[PDB]
Design a protein around this ligand. Structure first.
Ligand SMILES: [Cl-]
Ligand SMILES: [Cl-]
Length: 445
């Protein structure tokens, strides 16, 4: 166990900062850089659980890779057919993402493969991706009735593109199918019943592959070719969100977050904060590595106010609601969240864990079946403490820990957050940026 400690008192919160690279986009650059023609140089790379497992997999399959080192990776791509058979099982650790995306890719290879995982991944079913791949002609075996790992794939198959109506929305399953479709005969198409992130699609385009996005119908034609290029990874908006919130709840705060990724499938926190009356502007908009980026300028010039959060932004801000709950508490009036049933018990009930911590800090809130109700203690023009402090349980959820860390900007008492050791893995520079901004956080045993 590890814990964060924060002391009460009027904090400053200002500066120009760049948060770490987007987790998902970092991963995709490896997926496609490995099988592209020529060299790929990646910058702003953040290696997470997914990246490291995928990095090792392609190393095992003969790909030469320098790094990651200081956010830089050089990938000597081997072309669409340059992968070599792994000498043993490809260990995925806890990366279900790696396993699902590589399933599609591996099911199209000449050679056999086995994918295995740790105790947690070994329990996760893989039939939602395996089933459509089998329709394409893939030979993919799973374990037991629930179809969990190990996932055993037989190569040397001829895949055919299918038109697939996805029963349950999933960027991972969607991505797995499309990746197999790169080697398949004809067009592979996925129709998702609900909108998901499109980092896979955008990275494919960055590498020169044509991908049609036509409403909820996402498709490509197999036989194409990927071309190595330079990939600047956008900084993670999910990481930036904590400092957006911090700036919006701190008096006279002035924060510029540079090169923040603003993929429209990820920008829900911006729209929501804006609707809460936040002084938040999006300037210097441009594109890097097929991803849109911008500088986010947030000022604590006025008091947030509680709103009925827009339901059309919930899919776009799903991971940012723990941070937004902190904003809601400092806001004037009541905040209500609906249509966020996904947010409850998604193998971790963030609504309740936040509620527990918020209540400990003296905030009247109430979990609902599809969200939460928060009674904000904010008052227009008033920047007196909102939170009472206390001891907080994060349950090793980094987003919970980082959220309650921001609460230290408006607390009348000490805050101790337990189980914060996963914060550094997700957001390595979090406490550093916090300190540079004016939010001192002491890490302990
Ligand atoms: Cl994605
Ligand atoms: Cl998460």
């Amino acid at each position: 166990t590890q814990q964060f400690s924060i002391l009460p008192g009027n904090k400053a919160f200002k500066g120009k900062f760049t948060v770490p690279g987007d987790k998902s986009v970092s991963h995709r650059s490896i997926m496609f850089g490995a099988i592209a023609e020529g060299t790929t140089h990646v910058t702003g790379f953040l290696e997470g659980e997914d990246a490291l497992a995928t990095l090792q997999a392609f190393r095992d399959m003969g790909v030469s890779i320098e790094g990651p080192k200081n956010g830089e990776v050089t990938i000597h791509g081997v072309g669409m057919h340059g992968l070599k058979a792994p000498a043993s099982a490809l260990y995925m650790g806890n990366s279900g993402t790696s396993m699902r995306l590589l399933s599609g890719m591996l099911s199209a290879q000449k050679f056999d493969s086995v994918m295995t995982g740790d105790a947690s991944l070994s329990k996760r079913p893989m039939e939602r991706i395996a089933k459509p791949l089998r329709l394409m002609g893939a030979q993919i075996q799973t374990t037991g009735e629930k179809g969990t790992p190990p996932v055993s794939i037989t190569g040397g198959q001829q895949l055919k593109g299918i038109q697939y109506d996805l029963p349950m929305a999933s960027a991972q399953v969607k991505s797995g199918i499309l990746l197999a479709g790169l080697w398949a005969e004809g067009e592979t198409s996925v129709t998702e019943p609900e909108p998901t992130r499109d980092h896979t699609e955008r990275m494919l385009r960055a590498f020169g592959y044509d991908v049609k996005t036509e409403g909820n119908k996402i498709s490509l034609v197999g036989g194409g070719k990927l071309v190595g290029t330079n990939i600047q990874v956008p900084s993670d908006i999910s990481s930036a969100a904590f400092f957006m919130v911090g700036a919006a709840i701190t008096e006279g705060a002035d924060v510029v977050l540079e090169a923040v990724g603003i993929n429209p499938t990820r920008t829900g926190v911006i729209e929501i904060l804006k609707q809460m009356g936040a002084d938040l502007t999006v300037e210097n908009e441009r594109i890097a590595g097929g991803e849109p980026i911008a500088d986010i300028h947030i000022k604590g010039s006025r008091t947030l106010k509680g709103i009925h959060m827009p339901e059309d932004q919930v899919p776009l801000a799903i991971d940012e609601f723990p941070a937004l709950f902190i904003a809601a508490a400092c806001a004037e009036g009541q905040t209500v969240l609906t249509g966020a049933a996904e947010l409850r018990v998604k193998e971790s009930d963030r609504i309740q864990v936040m509620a527990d911590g918020l209540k400990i800090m003296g905030i009247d809130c109430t979990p609902t079946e599809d969200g939460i109700i928060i009674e904000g203690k904010g008052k227009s023009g008033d920047w007196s403490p909102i939170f009472a402090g206390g001891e907080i349980e994060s349950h090793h959820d980094h987003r919970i820990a980082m959220s309650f860390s921001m609460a230290g900007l408006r607390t009348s008492g000490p805050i101790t957050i337990h189980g914060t050791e996963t914060v550094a893995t997700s957001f390595p520079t979090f406490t550093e940026l916090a300190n540079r901004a004016g939010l001192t956080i002491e890490v302990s045993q």
